[PDB]
């Protein structure tokens, strides 16, 4: 606290409590008793536990039919209109598209649908897998991800 | 109709004015005016200048009949007490309070 360190009043004589510095956490405009440091909250989850988490999330996506597997699936013009119409055809609304490789057209088409995210077969993650309504995995991505999980 | 006439931030305590205000209550204005005119106080001046108002705001807004006009409800409320500082012996300072009072008069045909 930008201040001084002088006893605001002597130790005796005063009728008020024994105080030491205008900065004390008690006082108004004083310091916080335990000021939070800028910390890190990254916690280590074992490689094996992360793999064993994905190998369970995917099995349950299968069991819950939220995993729609397809062959090649992209577009020809980077038109979010085109991709949205394509999803209308697929009768879906909120989908994580795990393609084999980021197809710049598909990526640019999905950039602007806040219910659709296109990820390569490697940048997948549990939070997204679970959160998104349905995940569509091109068979390329299926093979890639199963070999990644090993 | 109960005509209201107030006086906010009146430069007078909230007790010295209640002393007067409790004299005139439920009394015909024809008598309350006399009482206040021949009351030896300073709050008498405030409450009389306010009762004059209430009567006038009755006769020029709510109709007429200064004849039948009782002081239905009159009350004095604490107001924003101005702080000031007065010095005492041995350097000590004591915060004195210039008091203020919201006078309210409510006169009705009744």
């Amino acid at each position: 606290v930008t201040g001084s360190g002088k006893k605001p009043w002597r130790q005796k004589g005063t009728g008020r409590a024994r105080s030491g510095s205008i900065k004390s956490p008690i006082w108004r405009s004083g310091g916080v008793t335990f000021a939070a440091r800028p910390q890190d909250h990254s916690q280590k989850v074992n490689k094996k536990m992360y793999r064993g988490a994905l190998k369970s999330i995917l099995s349950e996506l299968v069991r819950q039919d939220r995993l729609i597997v397809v062959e090649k699936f992209s577009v020809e013009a980077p038109k979010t209109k085109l991709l949205a119409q394509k999803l209308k055809d697929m009768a879906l609304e909120d989908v994580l598209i795990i393609t084999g490789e980021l197809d710049e057209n598909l990526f640019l088409a999905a950039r602007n649908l806040h219910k659709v995210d296109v990820r390569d077969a490697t940048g997948i993650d549990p939070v997204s897998l679970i959160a998104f309504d349905k995940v569509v995995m091109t068979a390329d991505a299926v093979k890639q991800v199963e070999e990644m999980l090993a | 109709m109960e005509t209201i006439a107030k006086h906010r931030h009146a430069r007078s305590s909230a007790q010295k004015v209640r002393l007067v205000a409790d004299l005139i209550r439920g009394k015909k204005v024809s008598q309350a005016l006399d009482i206040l005119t021949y009351t030896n106080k300073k709050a008498a001046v405030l409450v009389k200048k306010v009762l004059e108002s209430a009567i006038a705001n009755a006769e020029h807004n709510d109709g007429a009949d200064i004849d039948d006009l009782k002081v239905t409800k009159i009350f004095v409320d604490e107001g924003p007490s101005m702080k000031r500082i007065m010095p005492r012996a041995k350097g000590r300072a004591d915060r004195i309070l210039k008091r203020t009072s919201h006078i309210t008069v409510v006169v009705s045909d009744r």
Binding site: W9, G13, T14, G15 | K90, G91, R92
Partner: peptide, 14 residues
């Protein structure tokens, strides 16, 4: 206010 004086010499109850 900002200054406080010392109190009177207390009772010499020696």
């Amino acid at each position: 206010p900002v200054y406080i004086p010392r109190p009177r010499p207390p009772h010499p109850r020696l």
